[PDB]
Design an enzyme around this catalytic site. Structure first.
Site, mmCIF file in Angstrom:
data_model
loop_
_atom_site.group_PDB
_atom_site.id
_atom_site.type_symbol
_atom_site.label_atom_id
_atom_site.label_comp_id
_atom_site.label_asym_id
_atom_site.label_seq_id
_atom_site.Cartn_x
_atom_site.Cartn_y
_atom_site.Cartn_z
ATOM 1 C CB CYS A 1 24.827 -5.327 -26.400
ATOM 2 S SG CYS A 1 24.251 -3.743 -26.055
ATOM 3 C CG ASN A 55 25.105 0.925 -27.320
ATOM 4 O OD1 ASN A 55 25.714 1.213 -26.393
ATOM 5 N ND2 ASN A 55 24.183 -0.546 -27.614
ATOM 6 N N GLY A 56 22.365 2.441 -27.540
ATOM 7 C CA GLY A 56 21.485 3.074 -26.392
ATOM 8 C C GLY A 56 20.098 2.927 -27.029
ATOM 9 C CG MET A 89 -3.568 3.957 1.989
ATOM 10 S SD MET A 89 -2.161 2.587 2.194
ATOM 11 C CE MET A 89 -1.636 3.079 4.003
ATOM 12 C CD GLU A 103 12.775 1.348 -0.377
ATOM 13 O OE1 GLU A 103 13.212 1.363 -1.437
ATOM 14 O OE2 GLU A 103 11.967 2.266 0.054
ATOM 15 C CE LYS A 115 7.506 5.748 -3.237
ATOM 16 N NZ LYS A 115 7.784 6.327 -2.219
ATOM 17 C CB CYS A 146 -3.377 -0.504 9.164
ATOM 18 S SG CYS A 146 -3.825 0.717 8.105
ATOM 19 C CB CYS A 152 2.000 5.981 6.727
ATOM 20 S SG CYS A 152 0.685 4.879 6.952
ATOM 21 C CB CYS A 212 0.340 5.476 12.588
ATOM 22 S SG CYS A 212 -0.647 3.993 12.577
HETATM 23 C C1 LIG Z 1 3.339 0.885 3.934
HETATM 24 C C2 LIG Z 1 4.082 0.418 2.663
HETATM 25 C C3 LIG Z 1 5.332 0.324 2.501
HETATM 26 C C4 LIG Z 1 5.760 -0.212 1.298
HETATM 27 N N1 LIG Z 1 6.970 -0.216 0.978
HETATM 28 C C5 LIG Z 1 7.529 -1.086 -0.118
HETATM 29 C C6 LIG Z 1 8.884 -0.942 -0.337
HETATM 30 O O1 LIG Z 1 9.458 -0.540 0.469
HETATM 31 N N2 LIG Z 1 9.209 -1.380 -1.728
HETATM 32 C C7 LIG Z 1 8.457 -1.814 -2.752
HETATM 33 O O2 LIG Z 1 8.756 -2.373 -3.799
HETATM 34 N N3 LIG Z 1 7.074 -1.753 -2.360
HETATM 35 C C8 LIG Z 1 6.585 -1.088 -1.345
HETATM 36 N N4 LIG Z 1 5.149 -1.115 -0.927
HETATM 37 C C9 LIG Z 1 4.297 -1.538 -1.877
HETATM 38 C C10 LIG Z 1 4.033 -3.198 -1.697
HETATM 39 O O3 LIG Z 1 5.082 -3.735 -2.092
HETATM 40 C C11 LIG Z 1 2.780 -3.640 -2.836
HETATM 41 O O4 LIG Z 1 3.294 -3.218 -3.972
HETATM 42 C C12 LIG Z 1 1.556 -3.047 -2.406
HETATM 43 O O5 LIG Z 1 1.349 -2.978 -0.841
HETATM 44 C C13 LIG Z 1 0.454 -3.695 -3.027
HETATM 45 O O6 LIG Z 1 -0.731 -3.042 -2.905
HETATM 46 P P1 LIG Z 1 -1.914 -3.840 -2.289
HETATM 47 O O7 LIG Z 1 -1.745 -3.978 -0.497
HETATM 48 O O8 LIG Z 1 -3.235 -3.055 -2.172
HETATM 49 O O9 LIG Z 1 -2.178 -5.289 -2.937
HETATM 50 C C14 LIG Z 1 4.674 -0.538 0.189
HETATM 51 C C15 LIG Z 1 3.354 -0.500 0.643
HETATM 52 C C16 LIG Z 1 2.854 0.004 1.683
HETATM 53 C C17 LIG Z 1 1.446 0.097 2.061
HETATM 54 S S1 F3S Z 2 -3.456 3.400 10.691
HETATM 55 FE FE1 F3S Z 2 -3.150 2.713 8.514
HETATM 56 S S2 F3S Z 2 -3.358 4.282 7.151
HETATM 57 FE FE2 F3S Z 2 -1.063 4.549 7.992
HETATM 58 S S3 F3S Z 2 -0.823 5.638 9.624
HETATM 59 FE FE3 F3S Z 2 -1.284 3.762 10.394
HETATM 60 S S4 F3S Z 2 -0.652 2.393 8.711
#
Ligand SMILES: Cc1cc2nc3c(=O)[nH]c(=O)nc-3n(C[C@H](O)[C@H](O)[C@H](O)COP(=O)(O)O)c2cc1C
Ligand code: F3S
Lengths: 1472, 153
Positions: free
Chosen positions: A1, A231-232, A479, A886, A937, A1102, A1108, A1113
């Site tokens: 590459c 490239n790219g 959420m 993370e 996201k 929860c 959150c 909470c």
């Molecule tokens: C409160 C919360 C924090 C999360 N933090 C991370 C994160 O730091 N890094 C990451 O890759 N995914 C994070 N996730 C997403 C989860 O890794 C996973 O993709 C998700 O919880 C799956 O959804 P489900 O519980 O409905 O199956 C987070 C999810 C929630 C609810």
């Molecule tokens: S009750 Fe559940 S919806 Fe969020 S603020 Fe606490 S994890």
């Protein structure tokens, strides 16, 4: 590459350039895709000048006479399997060349050697031949080249006419030739022995090698191309092709003549992005322009509103951006005209490009600075290419133009400044527009009746409308999205809910926008399209707007300016028209638009303003789609514009899809009426109406930029009309007929369903006597509202079943959840076997099945320490794996507690911010994980509010307490798949026992990305869905981004099985898994492991409060308080019981199905059937693309290998065999070696051994030291701990000191170097990425993004590039030189010192979050003095020594840069 | 220049300091203020750069600090250079370098012209006494050898 180019400055042919090109190609084998075969490549090529004497001697030997003029040699690929195809193509070529009058000397068969090609690159090998054409008419060179190009195009068209396949032409010109193929890079001179001759001399050479994502090679797809090399990987081609389809219908030039007619479809079929770009470039060059001008017109610079360029370049860039749409995306280009040779970079400057001049009048440029062996006693200057820069060489006169000189020489040809003054703006027009003629406000009842007709609820005004006009920014949710998909729902979901957005996995980097907002433009131009092959003042006479969104007053002013040329179109249809009214309305409007445009109109305004009790409104998206597509197909879009007045536009996702469909401007008047009506009631307080409208427009533009940045597009002109969306649930016919380019893998409702929905809502709004709007439930659950996945009863029953530890309760829960009407894709499929049931006691035990479940990552910034620790303890008790996510982890938890409850986590994440990634953090795990994009996201970075950051989290992440932390959307380490392979190699070197997991997000096109990452030695793939939870995210990204994992999982499985790669990797899925039926379906689809996630949170307490992000909470799960953390109720036994029930449900279903293990069922798709909801709904969803069964054959349907996939050894191996006394006695050592650019990550495995033996801070500084002599590779000293000292004499390539963990690196030129150490680049891009400790001293200038995400390191470098110290968090950085724009952007902690001779820092700095002053405290002076003394001591520099000599008069030439958040917290204050 | 680069020895510098002299290092003369007899010396103050890769410092005059010292009698003691010997000894054939030091071979210490020899301080420059003594002894040996070889045959 990689790309590369060599040029003789004076312009005299010689064999040296060609042999050096071959030598450079022989040393790029480390970046390519190594294969177990050793013969299979993926493409390579070289592009040189024509060896006249060679072919003239050939012709003489044949028996003819050598002509006086130059020769022409065409290289062709003919079919090999047949003998009529060869003869037919030869006949076509010969009757097409002789139609002009030129003389054909004959054909020649190129000598080849098929001994080095593998199998699958040999089954499609074409027959390579050459044709020798001589010029006897005595025409000039330019005319000859023009006729050769025309002949090539006509031959291509004629051959395509007979549908004759397997044909290609690699070149036909009198100046240059191209040797390319599908072999390895080093085996190019073996396949083509012609290049080994003595008569192949040239004055320039270009070479390229690629890295394909699939394993099916096609020979006509290998670069370099004819007058281009790339490239790219380009982002916007689906939008640029559509605009070329409109530009073709007016372009014409007298150079071509009548022959112009046979170049109308300029972009043919079967090309990649690098092919279409090349074709456009060649057409634009062959018509008069020069290579630099075309490069500026296609890939322009970033036009910023700063005083750091002369106005000449600004006028030139304005003209260039006005005449053509840019071709964005990461691009390092090395192109050549017949005279010029240019090397250039894109707008953002992502790929690297480094060059070198030698005293032999020879310039060598490429992606790596150590490809060609050259002694430093021959160099004159080393350099780089910043964002938008270019370097040119003129061969006709033999000169070398750098960036600025070329810009000044190019801004002289034409009077650009006098031409640009023809542009007219609109704020001038709206200010001359008097404050008269405003109509009276609409009635409240009329407004409510119109709002009810589109389905707007009060929650659409109190939740997502109030924050916009109150704050200037958008709403925030915390959420996942458990709402049903659009087709399966039952209320009125607008048409803009069927379009999911797009984003970019590893193959392209998303563009961060909160920091580099200077390179993103929203300019809009009306009256713009025209002839693109012209140059005159009439090309820049148009109307220009600053944003595609217009208010009502601005719309009326623009309608004033338009006036007597525009035509308005109705967009309503009669409600009583019958069963086929909407189609007839579409027909009528798309006929009237065409009939009015042909009548001289230049502006079309598409309004639904006449909507009444007897006329329903056509959905604006469908209307603008039909109109734009018809105008494109009728060769009329080039004439007019397209303005839309809509009554449904209220969220930022509407404008995005409208501008993506093709509209020019969008006006939303009902939203403004609602804003005014809400303001007159006294709801906003004391702010005026104009301030509210300004805030609303600013929020809309910011959200539009966010949506545009998820994909990598930085300009709106190239995003418009490209269709960067996917429709899930629309009929294939409707999409393929009315929308330009979108894929509907499952067809859905046609026009009848849309008509039924629209008529139903219209009747409900206009015949039913409304008094108020419904509260509506879309983001929050409401009984009158829509259905949801998580209701109250389900949660209560699940928590009860978990806390009472009883299974029958859990089966009651399963029966409650598996009985609602369908809500997701996996609700329509049905299990059906043909065998006989087997007893329950025969299937696998619960242990072997529970060890298949894991919990996804949840950061400590979001969750509370107690819940995180509880999850970690529970998941390790049953033998499964947990995740830390993370945000790092607590080191003190690295040892088992005294109940044996180990709080560690078996999976560590490498986030985009590297917030806690150190050397010990990666050696305390069993199994790693790379996170590219999250399920909720996608194409975005995690957020953390400014009050969530307690002191503990601030210490754990090495940040500032009480500061908002937003992760960067891109990775700054992963800009393409080769960088992903490099990072995987790094991770596998730093930890010799763990595996590497890649986390993607389900969407279309993920199959090729998965087939590509599987070649980068990744062994676990994770596919998340769109319904995953999160800690904090905008609502638009939560509800309108991603796809269900049912699509992506099946696509990845089929694509991996097709490429014979499924037997090497494992598949893991998560997102919305609740029961055992879901797990069995996912296992049938192809997955082997499963993640649960949010259900675990419900087992711990929860109850889906969805607050959150507020840090309030009630239960105390996602909280950082003390008041609320004291209310935690979690216990590990709850989670253990949940997992036990979930596994035994799978046992139950398997035993009832007829199998005894999950390996019996994985991949067996034929056990699933599809039944639809009935003959009363008529959704035509066909999930057959989802149920296709690709036969494996020999291989199994799952992973069958043991351990990870080992990688080749670097120099580190030898070091470990030499520094044995250090590991046995623990004594001092000193080693010396020779480095080369084919050696990556030097000094990483040694750091791993040292960490395992003594730890990060166990050895004194400088215990073991290594001395390297030569240009080192990439990732030099990555993850180095204290006690290791590397000293390089020469230079480093890239990513030097990535993630420094306390070590020490020193880079200096050789002692025999005749170079100014403060004027030559020594290190590349992205230096010190996420370092926490150590020191780094360099004796040159750095590249771009110098010291990004620095946390504790200390660096002293004699220069910098653009985007330096971006988003820095801690440490000190001394820069003894100049800097670039957007310097210290997003800086939030640390300190900086700049040495200013030019007194030009206030022009480059980003005075947004940092303050710059002069040194006034001796305490901060001792710091700088000691740092420069240490620099002088180590690198023995001469610049810094002379600065130290004259200290008293140079101390007042330094600027001190300090963040704003660090104004209370500094301990010796900066002021007096 | 600085103190450590004094061309002569350093015992005499300390002797002069002990006897009553005052020294001004790193200063360059600019002009002489007066009417018919000098009344004062206007001088500047220069600054020396760091030693180059070849071992040569490049001084540069400071822009701000320029001063004047009261002077009743000034003495110019810059240096010394050879005269124009070929155009004064009537013989325009003696080979000379640029600065005026005539060329001579290393062994016999013989001038370009036959019979004539030249060795001492006019061939070196601003040397010391012992170098002149050595050059004189070598030239004596060479002259003896040449005269013996000539009268020999
Ligand atoms: C409160 C919360 C924090 C999360 N933090 C991370 C994160 O730091 N890094 C990451 O890759 N995914 C994070 N996730 C997403 C989860 O890794 C996973 O993709 C998700 O919880 C799956 O959804 P489900 O519980 O409905 O199956 C987070 C999810 C929630 C609810
Ligand atoms: S009750 Fe559940 S919806 Fe969020 S603020 Fe606490 S994890």
């Amino acid at each position: 590459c990689g790309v590369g180019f060599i040029a003789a400055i004076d312009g005299k042919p010689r064999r040296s350039v060609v042999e050096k090109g071959i030598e450079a190609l022989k040393a790029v084998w480390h970046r390519g895709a190594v294969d177990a075969d050793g013969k299979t490549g993926d493409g390579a090529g070289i592009h040189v000048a024509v060896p006249q004497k060679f072919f003239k001697d050939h012709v003489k030997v044949i028996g003819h006479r050598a002509p006086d003029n130059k020769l022409a040699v065409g290289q062709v690929f003919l079919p090999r399997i047949s003998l009529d195809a060869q003869e037919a193509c030869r006949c076509i070529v010969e009757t097409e060349i002789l139609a002009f009058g030129y003389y054909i000397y004959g054909w020649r068969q190129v000598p080849i050697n098929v001994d080095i090609i593998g199998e699958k690159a040999n089954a499609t090998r074409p027959e390579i031949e050459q044709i020798i054409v001589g010029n006897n008419k005595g025409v000039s060179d330019e005319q000859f080249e023009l006729d050769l190009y025309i002949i090539r195009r006509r031959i291509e068209k004629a051959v395509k006419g007979e549908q004759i396949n397997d044909f290609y032409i690699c070149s036909l010109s009198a100046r240059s030739i191209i040797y390319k193929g599908m072999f390895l890079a080093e085996q190019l001179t073996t396949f083509y022995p012609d290049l080994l001759d003595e008569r192949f001399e040239s004055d320039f050479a270009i070479y390229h090698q690629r890295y394909s994502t699939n394993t099916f090679p096609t020979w006509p797809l290998a670069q370099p191309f004819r007058m281009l090399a790339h490239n790219g990987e380009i982002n916007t081609v689906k939008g640029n092709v559509n605009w070329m389809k409109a530009h073709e219908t007016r372009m014409e030039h007298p150079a071509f003549g009548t022959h112009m007619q046979d170049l109308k479809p300029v972009i043919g079929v079967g090309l990649s992005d690098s092919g279409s770009l090349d074709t456009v470039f060649e057409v634009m060059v062959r018509a008069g322009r020069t290579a630099p001008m075309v490069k500026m017109m296609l890939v322009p610079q970033a036009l910023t509103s700063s005083q750091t360029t002369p106005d000449n370049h600004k006028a030139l860039i304005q003209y260039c951006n006005s005449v053509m749409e840019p071709w964005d995306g990461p691009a390092a280009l090395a192109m050549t005209d017949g005279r010029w040779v240019v090397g250039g970079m894109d707008r953002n400057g992502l790929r690297p490009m480094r060059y070198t001049i030698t005293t032999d009048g020879l310039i060598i440029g490429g992606s790596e600075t150590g490809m060609v062996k050259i002694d430093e006693t021959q160099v004159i200057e080393k350099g780089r290419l910043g964002p938008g820069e270019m370097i040119a060489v003129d061969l006709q006169s033999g000169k070398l133009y750098r960036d600025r000189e070329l810009k000044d020489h190019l801004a002289t040809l034409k009077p650009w400044d006098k031409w640009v003054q023809n542009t007219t703006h609109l704020d001038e027009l709206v200010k001359t527009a008097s404050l008269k003629g405003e109509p009276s406000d609409m009635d409240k009842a009329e407004l409510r009746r119109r709002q009810q007709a589109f389905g707007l609820t009060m929650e659409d005004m109190e939740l997502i409308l109030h924050p916009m006009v109150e704050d200037g920014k958008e709403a925030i949710g915390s959420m996942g999205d458990d709402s049903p998909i659009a087709v399966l729902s039952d209320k009125y979901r607008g048409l803009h809910h069927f379009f999911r957005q797009n984003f970019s996995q590893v193959t392209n980097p998303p563009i961060d926008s909160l920091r580099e907002r200077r390179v993103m433009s929203l300019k809009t131009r009306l009256g713009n399209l025209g002839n693109i092959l012209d140059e005159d003042e009439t090309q820049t006479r148009l109307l220009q707007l600053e944003s595609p969104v217009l208010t009502t007053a601005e719309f009326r002013a623009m309608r004033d300016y338009m006036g007597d040329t525009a035509a308005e179109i109705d967009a309503t249809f009669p409600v009583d028209g019958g069963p086929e009214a909407l189609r007839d309305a579409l027909r009528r409007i798309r006929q009237e638009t065409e009939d009015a445009v042909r009548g001289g109109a230049t502006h079309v305004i598409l309004t639904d303003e006449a909507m009444g009790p007897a006329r329903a409104a056509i959905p604006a998206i469908l209307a603008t789609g039909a109109v734009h597509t018809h105008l494109i197909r009728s060769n009329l879009r080039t004439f007019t514009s397209l303005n839309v007045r809509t009554a449904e536009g209220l969220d930022t996702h509407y404008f995005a899809v409208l501008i993506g469909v093709g509209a020019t401007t969008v006006n939303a008047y009902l939203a403004q009426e609602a804003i005014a009506e809400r303001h007159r009631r006294g709801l906003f307080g004391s702010m005026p109406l104009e301030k509210g409208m300004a805030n609303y427009k600013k929020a809309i533009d910011d959200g539009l930029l966010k949506i545009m940045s998820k994909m990598g597009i930085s300009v709106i002109s190239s995003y418009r009309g490209g269709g960067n969306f996917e429709a899930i649930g629309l009929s294939r016919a409707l999409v393929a007929e009315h929308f330009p380019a979108m894929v509907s893998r499952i067809s859905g409702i046609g026009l009848n369903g849309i008509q039924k929905k629209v008529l139903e809502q219209h009747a409900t709004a206009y015949n039913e006597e409304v008094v108020a709007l419904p509260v509506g439930g879309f983001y929050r659950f409401r009984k009158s509202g829509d259905r949801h996945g998580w209701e109250g009863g389900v949660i209560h029953t699940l928590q009860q079943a978990v806390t009472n530890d009883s299974y029958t309760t859990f089966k009651k829960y399963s029966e409650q959840v598996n009985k609602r009407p369908p809500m997701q894709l996996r609700d329509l499929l049905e299990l059906r076997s043909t065998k006989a049931p087997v007893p329950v006691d025969e299937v696998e035990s619960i242990t072997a099945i529970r060890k298949r479940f894991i919990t996804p990552g949840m950061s400590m910034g979001a969750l509370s320490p107690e819940a995180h620790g509880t999850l970690n303890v529970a998941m390790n008790r049953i033998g499964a794996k947990s995740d830390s996510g993370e945000g790092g982890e607590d080191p003190a938890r690295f040892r088992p507690d005294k109940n044996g409850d180990n709080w560690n986590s078996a999976i560590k994440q490498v986030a985009s911010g590297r917030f806690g990634v150190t050397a010990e953090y990666l050696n305390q795990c069993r199994e790693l994980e790379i996170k590219v994009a999250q399920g909720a996201k996608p194409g975005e970075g995690g957020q953390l509010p400014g009050f969530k950051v307690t002191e503990m989290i601030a210490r754990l992440r090495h940040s500032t307490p009480g500061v908002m932390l937003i992760s960067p959307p891109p990775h700054h380490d992963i800009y393409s798949i080769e960088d992903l392979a490099q990072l995987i190699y790094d991770l596998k070197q730093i930890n010799p026992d763990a595996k590497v997991t890649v986390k993607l997000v389900s969407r279309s096109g993920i199959g090729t990305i998965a087939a590509g990452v599987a070649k980068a030695n990744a062994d676990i793939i994770l596919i998340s869905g769109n319904s995953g939870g999160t800690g904090a995210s905008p609502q638009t990204s939560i509800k309108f981004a991603g796809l269900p994992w049912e699509m992506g999982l099946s696509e990845v499985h089929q694509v991996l099985t097709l490429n014979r790669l499924r037997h090497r990797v494992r598949l893991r899925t998560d997102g919305g898994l609740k029961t055992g039926r879901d797990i069995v379906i996912a296992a049938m689809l192809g997955a082997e492991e499963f993640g649960i996630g949010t259900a675990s949170l419900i087992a711990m307490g929860c109850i889906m409060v969805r607050q959150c992000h507020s840090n309030t909470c009630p239960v105390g799960v996602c909280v950082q308080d003390d008041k609320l953390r004291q209310k935690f109720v979690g216990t590990p036994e709850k989670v253990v019981n949940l997992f036990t029930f979930l596994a035994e449900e799978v046992r139950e279903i398997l035993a009832g199905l007829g199998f005894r293990s999950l390996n019996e069922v994985i991949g067996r798709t034929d056990l699933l059937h599809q039944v639809s909801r009935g003959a009363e709904h008529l959704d035509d969803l066909d999930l057959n693309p989802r149920l296709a069964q690709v036969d494996p054959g020999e291989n199994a349907r799952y992973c069958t290998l043991q351990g990870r996939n080992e990688v080749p050894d670097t120099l580190d191996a030898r070091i470990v065999a030499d520094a044995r006394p250090l590991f046995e006695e623990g004594e001092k050592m000193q080693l010396a070696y020779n480095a080369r650019n084919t050696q990556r990550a030097i000094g990483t495995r040694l750091s791993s051994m040292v960490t395992r033996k003594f730890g990060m801070f166990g050895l004194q500084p400088g215990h073991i030291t290594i001395r390297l002599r030569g240009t080192a590779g990439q990732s030099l000293g990555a993850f180095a701990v204290q006690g290791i000292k590397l000293e390089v004499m020469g230079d480093a390539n890239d990513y030097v000191g990535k993630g420094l963990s306390g070590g020490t690196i020193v880079v200096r030129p050789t002692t025999s170097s005749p170079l100014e150490t403060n004027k030559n680049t020594i290190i590349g891009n992205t230096v010190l990425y996420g370092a926490t400790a150590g020191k780094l001293f360099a004796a040159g200038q750095a590249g771009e993004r110098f010291a990004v995400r620095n946390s504790g390191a200390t660096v002293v470098v004699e220069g910098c590039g653009s985007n330096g110290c971006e988003y820095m968090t801690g440490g000190t950085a001394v820069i003894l030189g100049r800097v670039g724009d957007n310097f210290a952007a997003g800086m939030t902690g640390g300190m900086a010192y700049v040495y200013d001779l030019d007194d030009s820092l206030p022009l480059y700095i980003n005075d947004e979050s940092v303050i710059f002053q002069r040194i006034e405290v001796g305490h901060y002076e001792s710091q700088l003095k000691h740092l420069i003394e240490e620099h002088v001591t180590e690198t023995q520099s001469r610049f810094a020594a002379e600065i130290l000599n004259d200290w008293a008069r140079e101390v007042t030439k330094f600027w001190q840069v300090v963040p704003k958040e660090m104004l209370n917290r500094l301990e010796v204050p900066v002021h007096l | 220049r600085d103190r450590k680069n004094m061309p002569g020895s350093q015992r005499e510098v300390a002797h002069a300091e002990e006897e009553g002299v005052e020294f001004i290092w790193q200063a360059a003369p600019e002009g002489f203020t007066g009417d018919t007899v000098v009344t004062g010396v206007r001088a500047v103050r220069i600054h020396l750069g760091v030693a180059d890769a070849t071992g040569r410092q490049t001084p540069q005059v400071i822009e701000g600090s320029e001063f004047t010292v009261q002077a009743d009698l000034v003495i110019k003691a810059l240096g010394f250079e050879p005269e124009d010997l070929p155009n004064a000894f009537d013989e325009p054939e003696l080979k000379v370098t640029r600065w005026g030091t005539l060329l001579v071979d290393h062994r016999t210490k013989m001038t370009n012209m036959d019979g004539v020899f030249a060795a001492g301080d006019i061939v070196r420059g601003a040397s010391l006494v012992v170098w002149a003594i050595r050059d004189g002894r070598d030239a004596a040996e060479g002259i003896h050898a040449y005269a013996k070889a000539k009268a020999e045959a």
